[PDB]
Amino acid sequence: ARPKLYVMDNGRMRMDKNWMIAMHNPATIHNPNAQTEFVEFPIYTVLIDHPEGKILFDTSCNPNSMGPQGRWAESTQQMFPWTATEECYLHNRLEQLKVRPEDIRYVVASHLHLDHAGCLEMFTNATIIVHEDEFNGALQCYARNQKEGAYIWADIDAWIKNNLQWRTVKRHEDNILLAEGVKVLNFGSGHAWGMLGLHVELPETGGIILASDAIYTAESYGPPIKPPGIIYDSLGYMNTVERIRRIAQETKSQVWFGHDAEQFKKFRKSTEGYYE
């Protein structure tokens, strides 16, 4: 197989840096009212144009997330504001590559947060691969009518209404070989209830690990590891980062972080090319 892998720019988000890096700047006796910062970071998705079938990793935010008529709760909009030009919308990014949603064979949902699962509803022809624990957690949010937080009720509503084709990765399930040189990594609980990653082996570029929010940024990764404020299972989170580091070493893979502004700037984006 000679795939082409694309990085698609799906806009920017801002939030308290403490969400990204827990206790990044603790107050001290002579600085008792230490103030935080509102950091900007990229939202992106990855398309693997593979001869066996197109694979999409993450889906960014829904185009109708923000605004007075937005799907996101106002509180969510104020804490995690998403800014994106029309060109940044996933459907537009795919269109400019002459890729229709119906062309996508597999969508790998790293997790079901607002900035990763926003456009799942587009892909009614794909198998949606998601960690069973993440799926269960999101569905409970829905059933419990939770309208605030990182799991968007209106998004989940749409997934169900659109009759998406789910394939859950079981808690103790081994890696899934999706296609030649493409493996779904079962990271389990950490940042969220159930994290999935991808290992891609490209002929030219070599190994890539898509970590998503298992590792927010290079600052997260270190060493030393600097865990997030947004966290479910702290032990699991630490285990996963260390696991990724080992895999990266042993397979000579690059690690692509969830939301690293510096790393993202270096990427060849879908408007400039791809990785072979």
Annotated binding-site positions for Fe(3+): 115-116, 213, 259
DSSP state letters, 179-246:
ETTEEEEEEESSSSSSEEEEEEEETTTEEEEEEETTS-SHHHHSSSP---SS-S-HHHHHHHHHHHHH
User: From the CB of 189, what's the least distance to a copy of itself, in Å?
Assistant: 8
26 binds a copy of itself (CB under 8 A): yes
Token representation of residue 220:
């997260």
58 binds Co ion (CB under 5 A): no
Angle between helices 132-143 and 153-161 (to 10 degrees): 110
42: closest CA among 231, 253, 217? 217
Q: Which residues are annotated as a binding site?
A: 115-116, 213, 259
Token representation of residue 221:
């990764």
Stretch that binds a copy of itself, among 5-13, 74-82, 204-212, 213-221 (CB under 8 A): 74-82
154 binds a copy of itself (CB under 8 A): no
146 binds a copy of itself (CB under 8 A): no
* 38 vs 157 by CB, closer to a copy of itself: 38
Stretch that binds Co ion, among 41-49, 52-60, 63-71, 212-220 (CB under 5 A): 212-220
Q: Are 216 and 263 in contact (CB under 8 A)?
A: no
User: From the CB of 147, what's the least distance to a copy of itself, in Å?
Assistant: 16
192 binds a copy of itself (CB under 8 A): no
Spatial CB neighbours of 96, under 8 Å, sequence gap ≥ 6: 87, 270, 271
Q: Applying CB under 5 A, what is the total number of residues that bind Co ion?
A: 2
Classified as helix, coil or strand, 98 is coil
User: From the CB of 25, what's the least distance to a copy of itself, in Å?
Assistant: 9
Torsion of CA 64, 70, 73, 75, to 10 degrees: 100
234 binds a copy of itself (CB under 8 A): yes
Distance CA 106, CA 54 (A): 7
| Binding residue for Co ion, selected from 50, 71, 93, 113, defined by CB under 5 A | 113
User: From the CB of 216, what's the least distance to a copy of itself, in Å?
Assistant: 15
| Binding residue for a copy of itself, selected from 2, 5, 21, 38, defined by CB under 8 A | 38
Binding site for a copy of itself (CB under 8 A): 14-19, 22-23, 26-30, 32-38, 77-79, 81, 189, 229, 231-236
Binding site for Co ion (CB under 5 A): 113, 213
